[PDB]
Amino acid sequence: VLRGTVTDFPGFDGRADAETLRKAMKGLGTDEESILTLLTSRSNAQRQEISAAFKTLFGRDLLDDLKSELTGKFQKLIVALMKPSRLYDAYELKHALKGAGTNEKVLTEIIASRTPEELRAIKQVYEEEYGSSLEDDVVGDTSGYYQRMLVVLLQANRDPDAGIDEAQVEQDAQALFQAGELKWGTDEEKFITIFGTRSVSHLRKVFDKYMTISGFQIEETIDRETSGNLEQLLLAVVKSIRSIPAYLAETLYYAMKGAGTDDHTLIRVMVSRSEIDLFNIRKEFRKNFATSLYSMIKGDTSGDYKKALLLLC
């Protein structure tokens, strides 16, 4: 079931790759074609071995070098690829929080689409890395029921997929129905517990029972794919309970639709899911948007930044 687009390069030699990269950057200029094609055909653990090998051979730091040589969206994309996989979501989360304001989009996206296993690991790396708790930094930045629901999801304690209790499926479908009709503005406490704590197989049966009660799908009610942090989060959780590859396909779609490109979302999803389910996200994208992701990127992006995203894709 989950398939990535980037795997370990067979016949890898970290020293040989350290030398190619050194050659590509040494002296006047920069060979971006060579950097781009090597780093998108190596997996993230191999990139860490190349950095190690580059410091042993040359006494230089590879990422600081990539950063002085490269520029703009291509530099942002190569810097993201060099981030150890284990640290990347934690990094993104620290940067949505830190500073004035907060970037709610990244906050909703990663806490709603990551599994409990991913989240236990994220919370642990964040503390170790940044010295504060993710939970505390979230409570310091967010407010109201949006804050509460983030904290519920950050406990990473959803019920197990086990005994499906239809009395409880019926009860909960009813409550969501009643909450939906009231525009998710009334028994917040009641519904936040159902969305953050029930098992995924229970909630899929609930969403189906909601359908037969209302005549429609629950995202039609929460649908205002714009405005209000908790509703955006309710929509991201519902879509992710249904299919995380489908929900990330859609956030990709919407990063490129309209005037502009949200390149930050486009790098973040492309890089974070490259070795997990980016293949699944590709199939979902074509299936729901009747265009491949490749072609959507190709029309939306330019230069070596485009060359590198199309090789990851």
Residue ranges that bind Ca ion, judged by CB under 5 A: 25, 30, 69, 102, 141, 256, 261
What is the closest distance, in whole angstroms, from the C-beta atom of residue 29 to Ca ion in the complex?
5
Side-chain half-sphere CA neighbours of 166 within 13 A: 1
On the 0-12 / 13-18 / 19+ scale of CB atoms within 10 A, 130 is: middle
265-274 as b/e: b if 16+ CB within 10 A: bbbbbbbbbb
The angle subtended at Cα 307 by Cα 305 and Cα 311, nearest 5°, is 115
What is the closest distance, in whole angstroms, from the C-beta atom of residue 258 to Ca ion in the complex?
5
What is the closest distance, in whole angstroms, from the C-beta atom of residue 121 to Ca ion in the complex?
23
> Which DSSP category does 184 fall into?
T
Decide whether 93 or 112 has the Cβ nearer to Ca ion.
93
Decide whether 7 or 302 has the Cβ nearer to Ca ion.
302
* CA neighbor of 219 nearest in space, from 195, 249, 198: 195
17-45 as b/e: b if 16+ CB within 10 A: bbbbbeebbeeeebebeebbebbbebbbe
Decide whether 69 or 172 has the Cβ nearer to Ca ion.
69
Decide whether 17 or 141 has the Cβ nearer to Ca ion.
141
What is the closest distance, in whole angstroms, from the C-beta atom of residue 31 to Ca ion in the complex?
6
Side-chain half-sphere CA neighbours of 101 within 13 A: 5
Decide whether 10 or 27 has the Cβ nearer to Ca ion.
27
Decide whether 96 or 234 has the Cβ nearer to Ca ion.
96
305 close to 40: Cβ distance less than 8 angstroms: no
- Residue with the shortest CB distance to Ca ion: 30
Integer CA distances (angstroms), 282 to 3, 245, 248, 256, in order: 10, 8, 10, 15
What is the closest distance, in whole angstroms, from the C-beta atom of residue 99 to Ca ion in the complex?
5
What is the closest distance, in whole angstroms, from the C-beta atom of residue 164 to Ca ion in the complex?
40
